[PDB]
Amino acid sequence: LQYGPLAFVLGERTTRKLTETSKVITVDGNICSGKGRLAREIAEKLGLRHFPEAGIHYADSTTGDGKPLDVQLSGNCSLEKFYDDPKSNDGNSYRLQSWLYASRLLQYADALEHLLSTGQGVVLERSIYSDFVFLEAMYRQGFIRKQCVEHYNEVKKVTACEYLPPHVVVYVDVPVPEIQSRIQKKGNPHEMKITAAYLQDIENAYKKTFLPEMSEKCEVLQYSAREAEDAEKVVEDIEYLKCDKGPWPDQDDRTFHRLRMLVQNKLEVLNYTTIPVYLPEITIGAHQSDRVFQKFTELPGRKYSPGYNEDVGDKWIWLK
Amino acid sequence: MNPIIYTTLIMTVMSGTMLVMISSHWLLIWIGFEMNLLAMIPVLMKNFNPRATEAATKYFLTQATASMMLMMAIIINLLYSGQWTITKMFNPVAMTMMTMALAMKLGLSPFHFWVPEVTQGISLQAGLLLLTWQKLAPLSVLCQISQSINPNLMLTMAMLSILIGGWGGLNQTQLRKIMAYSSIAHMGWMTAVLPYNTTMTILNLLIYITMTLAMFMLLIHSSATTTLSLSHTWNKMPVITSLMMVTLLSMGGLPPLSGFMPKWMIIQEMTKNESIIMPTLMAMTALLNLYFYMRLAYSSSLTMFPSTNNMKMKWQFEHTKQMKLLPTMIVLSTLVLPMTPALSSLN
Amino acid sequence: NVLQIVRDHWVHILVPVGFVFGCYLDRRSDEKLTAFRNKSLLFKRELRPNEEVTWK
Amino acid sequence: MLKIIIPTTMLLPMTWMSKHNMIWINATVHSLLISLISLSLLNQLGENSLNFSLTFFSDSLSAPLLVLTTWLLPLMLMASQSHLSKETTTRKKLYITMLILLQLFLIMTFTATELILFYILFEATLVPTLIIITRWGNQTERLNAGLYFLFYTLAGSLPLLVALVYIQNTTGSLNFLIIHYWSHPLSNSWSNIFMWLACIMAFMVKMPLYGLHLWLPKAHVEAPIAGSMVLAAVLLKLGGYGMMRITTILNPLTNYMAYPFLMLSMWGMIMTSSICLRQTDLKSLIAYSSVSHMALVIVAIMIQTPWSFMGATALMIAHGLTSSMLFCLANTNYERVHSRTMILARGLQTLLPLMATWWLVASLTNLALPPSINLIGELFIITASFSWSNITIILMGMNMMITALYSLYMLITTQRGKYTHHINNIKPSFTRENALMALHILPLLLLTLNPKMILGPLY
Amino acid sequence: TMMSGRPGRVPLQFLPNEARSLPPPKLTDPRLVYMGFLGYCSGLIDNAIRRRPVVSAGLHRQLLYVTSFVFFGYYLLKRQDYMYALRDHDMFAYVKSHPEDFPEKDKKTYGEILEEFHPVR
Amino acid sequence: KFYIREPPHGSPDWLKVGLTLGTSVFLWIYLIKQHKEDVLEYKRRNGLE
Amino acid sequence: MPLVYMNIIMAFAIALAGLLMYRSHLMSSLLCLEGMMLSLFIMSTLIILNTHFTLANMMPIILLVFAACEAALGLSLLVMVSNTYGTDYVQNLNLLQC
Ligand SMILES: CCCCCCCCCCCCCCCCCC(=O)OC[C@H](COP(=O)([O-])OCC(O)COP(=O)([O-])OC[C@@H](COC(=O)CCCCCCCCCCCCCCCCC)OC(=O)CCCCCCCCCCCCCCCCC)OC(=O)CCCCCCCCCCCCCCCCC
Ligand SMILES: CCCCCCCCCCCCCCCCC[C@@H](O)O[C@H](CO[C@H](O)CCCCCCCCCCCCCCC)COP(=O)(O)OCC[N+](C)(C)C
Ligand SMILES: CCCCCCCCCCCC(=O)OC[C@H](COP(=O)([O-])O)OC(=O)CCCCCCCCCCC
Ligand SMILES: Nc1ncnc2c1ncn2[C@@H]1O[C@H](COP(=O)(O)OP(=O)(O)O)[C@@H](O)[C@H]1O
C-alpha cells in the first residue's frame, strides 16, 4: 500500500531503511561549467541516482508521458527570449525565474522522496538553496524588479523552510574569462549574448552568500576546473567526510515520517508556489487562464486521472 | 506528533463526549467535559506555531472557566436538593449558572469571541473537529436539561448569537472566521428552538454538522484558507468550486436545498407555541449569513478571478490523498429536503 | 452503420418513455382515489350488466 | 401532471448525454413536444378545477401559465444557442440544465395544490435564475443585480413563510380547496392586518409593486437574453398567481388594506410610463414597461372583482408574450452592435426590413391595439376600475397615452431616421431570429382569435 | 422531549418488537427510489471529484452506493412509519381517555348558522 | 504504455472489486429476505394470511 | 443556610471575579483558577459531610484530581507562551483577532 500513518504504525522506518550512504549531494557552479560532468561521475562512482539540472519541462518529464509539453502549457517562458531581450515588458525574466524555482523545488521533493523510500543517495545538478543567485544577478542587472525579488523571497521562505539541506555541497569555481571562453567555444548565440556583468553577479552571489550560508549547515567542497576534471579525488574526498553537523543526525522517525508524507504529495509541495500576489509578470487573466486550461485538458492523457484515459489505451474503466 | 498519540488523543476526546452523553451522574458528566478538554488541547496545538499556541491557550481558558461555573452549578443544585442525577435542576440559581456555563462552552453570544479567534488560530482539520464535536456535547447536556431552561435567557442568548454571527461573518474575509461566525449563527438557531423541541434541535444539529463537514472537507481539498486562495481553485479543479457553491447556497437556507429544512421546521415549531416575532426576526436575520455566503460564492465559482503561472504545474499534478465520505456529505447537505418526515425517526 | 447511429440517437427515446411513464403514474394515482366512485349524489347510478366500475 | 413533469426530468439526462453538436437540436425538439403535450390542459371545466391527485391540480388560471412556460422554453433555447456559441460543451449543458430546472420548478409551482409546497417551489425558482444571471451575464453589474433580486424577493417571502405556517397551525390545513371551502371572514385587528401585510407584501415584491421594483431594472437589464425572457414572461406572473390564490382568506380586510397598494400601483404606473419616455437604454425601457403593466395587474387584483380577474389573467399572458418578443428584438440589435444604447443604432428600418416589421408588430401589441389580448385585458381592468371609482378612468387614460407615446418613440428611434454612418457590421437578419420572432407573435394573434382560453376561471 | 420517556421504551433500540405489527414499506416505495437516486448522485459526485468518467467509471462503486443508500433508507422508513403510527395511537388513546376535554359538539347547518355578508364594491 | 510512471490505478484492484460486488449482492439478498419476513410477520400478527 | 456556606460561596465568587479580570500575568490567572476549585472542594465536602452522604466522600478526591490536571494543562500552555514571547503576559496573545 501507499505510505501513510498505517504503514508507520506497521513498522516502516526511514532510519531502518537508511544505509549510512543515503546522502544528498548538490553540485553547483557558474554558467557553462563542468558541474554536470562532475555530478554524473560522482553519481556513477558512489552509486547514487543522478538528477540533472531542473530546467523547464522537468514537470513534463515527471508526469504523464516523458515527452515535454508545449511551452504555452508548461512554463510560458523562454530562456532564449530572456537571453535575447532580458528587459522585456512582458515579465518573461521573472516568469522564467519563478517557474525554474518551482521546478527545482519539485525536483528536490522528488529526490528526497526517492532517498527516503529507497535509501539511495541523490546527486542534484542544482538545488533550491543555490537558485537565488540567478535572481540576484537578474535584479542587479535591472532585468527584474524589487517587487519580483520580494515575491521570490516570500515563496522561497514559505516553501524551502520545510525541507532538509543537502549533505554535501560541491562548488566548482571557474573565473569569468574562462566562462566566456567556454561560452564562445560552445557556439550557442543566445548564451553568446550573455554580458560579462551578469556572469560576474552569479559568481559574486555564489561566493559571498551561498557558500557562507551552506558552510554553517554542513561542509562545503570548493574545486577549480582542473580539480573537478579529476573526479576520483572528488569521490575520495566525499567518502572521507565523516563530519555531519546538519539536522540529519538530529532527525528522528517521526520527523522523517512527516517529511516523507510532505514530499510524496506534490500538490502539498507546490502549495505556496501559487499565492495571490498579483505581480504583472506572473498574473494571468481569467480568459487566458480558461483557454490554456481548456487546451491542457484537451491534451491526450490529461482529461481524467492517469488510470482513466481511454484515448491513451486504458481498459477496465467500468471496473476500476 | 506520533500517529498513535494523535489517534489516542482523538479517541480520548470521543470517549469524553460519549461519557457525557451516556452518564446519568453530574460528576461523571463533568469528568467527561474535563477529559474532552484535556485531550482536545494538544489536537489544537498539533501544528506548532504562535497562532496555534495562542488559540489553544484561549480555548483552554474559556473551557476551564465554563467547567468551573458548571461544577459550581452542580454543587449548588446538590445543596438545595441532595441529588446527583441529571434531571430538571431544583434551583433557579444553579440552573442559571449551568445555562451560562454551557452557553460559554458552545460559544453562544455574548461568549462568542473565542470561537472565531480559535478557529482562525487552528488548522482546517482542527477547526472541523472543534466545531462538530464541541458543539455536539454541550447541546446534548442542554437537551437533557431543557425542561428547566429559562426561556427568556435562552432566547436572548440565541438571538444575540444569530445577530453577532451574521455581522461578524459579514465583515470577515478569512474562510475559517467565516465558518466560525456561521457556526455561531447556527448555534443561535438551535438553542432558540431548544426550549420547545429538542427533536428539532437535534435535526438542526445533524444538518449543520453535515454541511460543516462538507464545507471543511472542500476547503481541505482546495488547500485554501483565505478568499483569494479560494479564488484560484476554479483554474485547477472547477468541480470543487461548483460543489462548494451549491453547498454555500444550501447553508444560506435557500430552497429546495437541505439547509431550508432546519429553518422551516424550527419556524413551524416556534409558531406552534404562539411565538411570531422571534421566528420572523430569526428568519430575517439569516439574510446576512446568506449575503456573505453569496459573496464567497461570487469569488470562487460564479466568476473567474485571475490566476498565476505555476498553476500549470499544479494542473500537471494530481490530488493524491482522498477524504472518504465527502460525496456523501455533499449529497446529504443539498438533496435531503424531500426526506424531511424522517425527523419522526429522529424523535 | 446502425450501431453507430443508435449510439448517437438513443437519447431521443428518453422524453417519450418519460411521457409514457408519467401517463402510467397518473393512472396509478387515479386508481388510489376511487373512494367515492359511483357514490356521489349527482352521478350515482346502477351498473350496466357487463361493467364492473363506472370509471378507471 | 406527471405526464408533463416526468418528460422534463428526462430532458435533463437527454441534455447531459447528447452529443456536443446536437444538444440544442434535441432540447428544442423535445421542448416543443412537451409544449404540445401540455396544450391538453386547456380543456378546463365550467364548475371546478382539474384535481389530478392529492399533490397537483390544474385550473383555468394555471393552464395558460403552464402552456406559456412550456412554449417559452424553446425560444429561450434558440436565443441561448445564438449567444453561447463559444462556450464549452459542459457549460452549454449546464446552461440548458438551468433552463430545464427553472421550467420544472415553474410547472410544479403553477400546479401545486398546497400553499406551503407552492411557497417552496416559487422560492426554488430563485436559484437557477440567480445562477444564470450572475454567471452568464455580460456586464459587471450582474453581481449587484443578482444580489438586489435575491434579497428583495427573500425579504418579501420570509414573512410569507411565517404567515403560512401560522395559518396551518390555526386552521389545520394549507390545501387550497380546504382553505377555499372552509374560508372564514378576517376580523379587523392588528394581527389580521399584519398577516394580510405579510402575504400581500411577499407577492407585491414578486410582482413588483411600485417602490419595490428596483431589482427588476437591475436584473432584467443585466441578465442574459434567456434570463430576461423568463424573468418577464413567467417569473413576474408568480406574484399575480399567488395574489389570486391567497386573497381567498383575506376578505373582508382586503376592502380596507388595498388603498395604499392601489394608490402606489396607479401613480407608479404613471411614473414608470413617464420614465419609459426618457430612457437612454432599451432594456431599461422594456423593464419599466413591464413594471407599468404589472402595476395595472396589481390594481385589478386589489379591486378584486370577477371582471378584474379575467382582465388580469389576459393582461398577464399578453404581457408575457410581448415582453419576451421585445427582449428578443433588443437582444438581436445588441448582438449586432454590442451596445444597449437606444440611439447608437438607427435606420434599422432601411437596414433590416423584416426585422422592422417585427418591431412594428411588437410595438403595436405593446400598446393596447384592439382586438389584441393586451387590449382585452387592459380594457377589462379599466372597466372594473371604472366601476370601482370614476377617476381611475383619468389615471388609466393618462397611462394609455404615455404607453402609446413611449412605444412609438422606441419604434421611431430604433427603426426610423437615417442609419449610423460608421456602423457597418449589421449583417442580414438570420433565419433563426426571424423564426423566433414569428413564434413569439403568431400565438398572440391566435389567442386574439380565441380569447376565452386566457380569461381565467371567472369566465 | 415529547415521545422520549414513553413507558416501556427500550433504550438504544432502533426498532422495537411492536413495530413488527405494522405494514412494511414496499420495495418500490417512492421514498426508497429517492434514496437510491441519492446514492446514484453520491456515486456520480465521487467519480467527478476523483476525476474519473462520471457515468462510466466505477460501476461496482455506484452499485454499492445505491445498495447502501437503499438499505439504510428502508430501515429509516420503517422507523419513521413506526414513530408516526405510535404518535397517532397515543393521540387516539388520549382522546378516548379524556372525553371531558374532547366533547362532541352539536352540528348546525348553514341554514341555521348566521354569517355576516361583506359586499365587494 | 503511455505513462512514464506506472499509474496507481493502472490495473483493477480485483480484491476491492470482489469485495464491493459481494457486499452489494449480500445487501440486496438480505434486504429481500428482510422484506419477505416483515410482510409475513405483519400478516401473522394482523391475522390476514 | 448557615453563614459558612455564605462565606464559601463568596470565596468562589471572588475567585471567579479574579479570573475574569486579568492584570498582566497568565500565572496569576492560573492561581485564581486554582482557587475556584479549592472553594468548590470545600463547599462540596462541607455539604457532603453535613448530610452524611457516605458514598459521596470520593467525589472531592476526583475533583482535586481533575483540578490539578487542569493546572498541569495551564502550566504547559504557560511555558509554551513564555518560550514564544519571553514573558507570560496576556497582552502578547493578540495575534488572533475577533
Ligand atoms: C442527470 C442530469 C442532471 C440532473 C440534475 C438534477 C439535480 C441532481 C444533481 C446530481 C449531479 C450528479 C453529478 C455531479 C457531478 C457532475 C460533474 C460533471 O461535470 O459532470 C459532467 C458529466 C459529463 O461530462 P464529463 O466530461 O464526463 O465530466 C468531466 C468533468 O467533470 C467536466 O467538468 P470540467 O472539468 O470541464 O469543469 C466544468 C464544470 C465542472 O463543474 C460541473 O460540471 C458542476 C458539477 C457539480 C454540479 C452540482 C452537483 C449536484 C449538487 C446539488 C444539485 C441540486 C439541484 C437542485 C437545486 C437547484 C439548482 C442548484 O465547471 C463549470 O462549468 C463551472 C462554471 C459553472 C458553475 C456554476 C454552476 C454549478 C452547478 C449549479 C447547479 C447544480 C444543479 C444541476 C447539476 C447538474 C450536474 C450534471 O455529466 C454527467 O455526468 C451528467 C449526469 C449524467 C447521468 C446519466 C445517467 C444515465 C443515462 C440516463 C438515464 C436516465 C434515466 C433512465 C430511466 C429508464 C429509462 C428507460
Ligand atoms: C441528513 C443529515 C445526516 C443524517 C445522518 C444521521 C446519522 C445518524 C447516526 C446513526 C445512524 C444509524 C443508527 C442505527 C443504530 C443506532 C440506533 C439507536 O442506537 O439509536 C436510536 C435513535 O437514533 C436515531 O433514531 C437513528 C438515526 C436517525 C437519523 C435520521 C436523520 C433524519 C434527518 C432528516 C432528513 C432525512 C435524511 C435521510 C438520509 C439520512 C434509538 O436510540 P434512543 O435511545 O431511543 O434515542 C435517544 C435520543 N433521545 C434521548 C433524544 C431520545
Ligand atoms: C457485509 C458482509 C460482506 C463482506 C464484508 C464487506 C465489508 C464492506 C465492503 C467493503 C467495500 C469496499 O471495499 O469497496 C468500497 C467501494 C469502492 O472502493 P474504493 O476504491 O473507493 O475504496 O465502494 C464504496 O466506496 C462504498 C461506498 C459507500 C459509502 C457509504 C454509504 C453510506 C450509506 C448510508 C448513508 C446514509
Ligand atoms: N534560475 C535560473 N534563471 C535563469 N537562467 C537559468 C536558471 N537556471 C539555469 N539557467 C540557465 O540554464 C542554462 C543551463 O546551462 P548549464 O547546464 O549551466 O551549462 P553547462 O552544463 O555547460 O554548465 C544556463 O545558460 C543558465 O543561464
UniProtKB/Swiss-Prot annotation, chain B:
It comes from the Eukaryota. One of its GO terms (cellular component) is mitochondrial inner membrane. It catalyses: a ubiquinone + NADH + 5 H(+)(in) = a ubiquinol + NAD(+) + 4 H(+)(out). InterPro entries: Complex_I_Subunit_2, NADH_DH_su2_C, NADH_UbQ_OxRdtase_chain2, ND/Mrp_TM. It is a multi-pass membrane protein. The chain crosses the membrane at residues 3-23, 25-45, 59-79, 89-109, 149-169, 178-198, 200-220, 237-257, 274-294, 325-345. Keywords: Electron transport, Membrane, Mitochondrion, Mitochondrion inner membrane, NAD, Respiratory chain, Translocase, Transmembrane, Transmembrane helix, Transport, Ubiquinone. One of its GO terms (molecular function) is NADH dehydrogenase (ubiquinone) activity. The keyword Electron transport applies. One of its GO terms (biological process) is reactive oxygen species metabolic process. It is found in: Mitochondrion inner membrane. The keyword NAD applies. Its EC number is 7.1.1.2. It is an enzyme of class 7 (translocase). It holds the Pfam family NADH_dehy_S2_C. Belongs to the complex I subunit 2 family. Core subunit of respiratory chain NADH dehydrogenase (Complex I) which is composed of 45 different subunits. Interacts with TMEM242. Core subunit of the mitochondrial membrane respiratory chain NADH dehydrogenase (Complex I) which catalyzes electron transfer from NADH through the respiratory chain, using ubiquinone as an electron acceptor. Essential for the catalytic activity and assembly of complex I. This is NADH-ubiquinone oxidoreductase chain 2. It comes from Sus scrofa (Pig). The lineage of its organism: Eukaryota, Metazoa, Chordata, Craniata, Vertebrata. The gene is MT-ND2.
From Swiss-Prot, chain G:
InterPro entries: NADH_UbQ_OxRdtase_chain4L/K, NUOK/Mnh_C1-like. The chain crosses the membrane at residues 1-21, 29-49, 61-81. GO terms for biological process: ATP synthesis coupled electron transport. Gene3D superfamilies: 1.10.287.3510. It holds the Pfam family Oxidored_q2. Its main location: mitochondrion. GO terms for cellular component: mitochondrial inner membrane; respiratory chain complex I. Core subunit of the mitochondrial membrane respiratory chain NADH dehydrogenase (Complex I) which catalyzes electron transfer from NADH through the respiratory chain, using ubiquinone as an electron acceptor. Part of the enzyme membrane arm which is embedded in the lipid bilayer and involved in proton translocation. This is NADH-ubiquinone oxidoreductase chain 4L. It comes from Sus scrofa (Pig).
